[PDB]
Design a protein around this ligand. Structure first.
Ligand SMILES: [Cl-]
Ligand SMILES: [Cl-]
Ligand SMILES: [Cl-]
Ligand SMILES: [Cl-]
Ligand SMILES: [Cl-]
Ligand code: NA
Ligand code: NA
Ligand code: NA
Length: 232
C-alpha cells in the first residue's frame, strides 16, 4: 500500500456520514497511519505511545507528534512546512478543546489546502474542508510526513448511507460503474476484508464482470467504524 492508496482510502470516506473508529479526530489519523505502516509495533496506529507523553492515559491530538515514535516507522516530523499531500498535521489547543486537533493533508493548490478530518465541528465523521495555508500554518504543532481475508457468503446488503460507489475492483481508485443509494438492496456472493482498508462485498454483474462495493473501514482485520449498511 502506497501513500497515494492510503490517501485514496481516506478520500473515499467523504460523504459517508459515518465515523471511522470511535469518532475522534485521531481515529482517522490512526487508520491512515496503519494503512501506510501496517506492521509497526510502536506508534499511534499500533496503539503504543510514550506513557510519559500523556496524562490520564488519554490521547491528546496536539501532542501526537511527540507522544508517538514516528521515526521508528520511517515517518519524519517537523515544526516547519511546507504542507504536502499525505502529511498528518497536528494543531494546537484552543478555547473549548484542551487537546487540539489532528488532520490529514489531501492536496495543496497554491495557498489552498485540502484537508481530510473527523470531528472538526462536532461532525464526528470524515469531512473534506478547505483552508488557507498562510492562515492554517499558524496553528500547526507538527508536520508528520510518511516514508486481504476473503470468503464466500450469500447475503443481501441494505444501504444506510446516502450512496456507495460500485467498482470494478476492490480498491478506491477502481472507478465508478454506478452507485447504490440509501435504502436500496442488492445481493452479493463474496466478502473481502482488507486488513487495513474496507470490508468489500462482491458479485458478478450484469455484463459478466465482477463488481465490488465498499461497506465501511477496517483496521487490523476488524471493522473500524460502523458498517455502511445492514446485512442478512
Ligand atoms: Cl515512556
Ligand atoms: Cl518506542
Ligand atoms: Cl498547543
Ligand atoms: Cl453492478
Ligand atoms: Cl471480472
Ligand atoms: Na510497516
Ligand atoms: Na468507494
Ligand atoms: Na478499475
Amino acid at each position: 500500500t502506497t501513500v497515494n492508496e492510503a490517501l485514496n482510502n481516506v478520500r473515499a470516506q467523504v460523504g459517508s456520514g459515518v465515523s471511522v473508529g470511535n469518532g475522534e479526530c485521531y481515529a482517522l489519523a490512526s487508520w491512515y497511519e496503519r494503512m501506510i505502516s501496517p506492521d509497526a509495533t510502536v506508534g499511534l496506529g499500533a496503539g503504543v505511545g510514550w506513557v510519559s507523553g500523556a496524562t490520564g492515559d488519554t490521547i491528546s491530538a496536539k501532542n501526537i507528534g511527540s507522544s508517538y515514535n514516528w521515526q521508528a516507522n520511517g515517518w519524519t516530523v517537523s515544526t516547519s512546512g511546507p504542507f504536502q499531500a499525505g502529511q498528518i498535521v497536528t494543531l494546537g489547543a484552543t478555547s473549548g478543546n484542551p487537546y487540539g486537533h489532528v488532520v490529514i493533508v489531501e492536496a495543496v493548490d497554491g495557498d489552498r489546502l485540502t484537508i481530510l478530518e473527523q470531528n472538526y465541528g462536532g461532525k464526528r465523521y470524515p469531512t473534506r474542508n478547505y483552508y488557507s495555508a498562510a492562515s492554517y500554518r499558524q496553528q500547526v504543532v507538527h508536520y508528520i510526513t510518511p516514508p486481504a481475508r476473503t470468503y464466500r457468503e450469500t447475503g443481501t446488503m441494505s444501504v444506510t448511507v446516502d450512496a456507495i460507489n460500485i467498482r470494478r475492483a476492490p480498491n478506491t481508485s477502481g472507478q465508478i460503474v454506478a452507485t447504490y443509494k440509501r435504502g436500496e438492496s442488492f445481493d452479493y456472493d463474496t466478502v473481502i476484508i482488507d486488513t487495513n482498508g474496507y470490508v468489500w462485498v462482491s458479485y458478478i454483474g450484469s455484463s459478466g464482470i465482477r463488481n465490488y462495493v465498499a461497506t465501511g473501514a477496517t483496521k487490523d482485520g476488524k471493522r473500524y467504524g460502523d458498517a455502511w449498511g445492514t446485512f442478512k
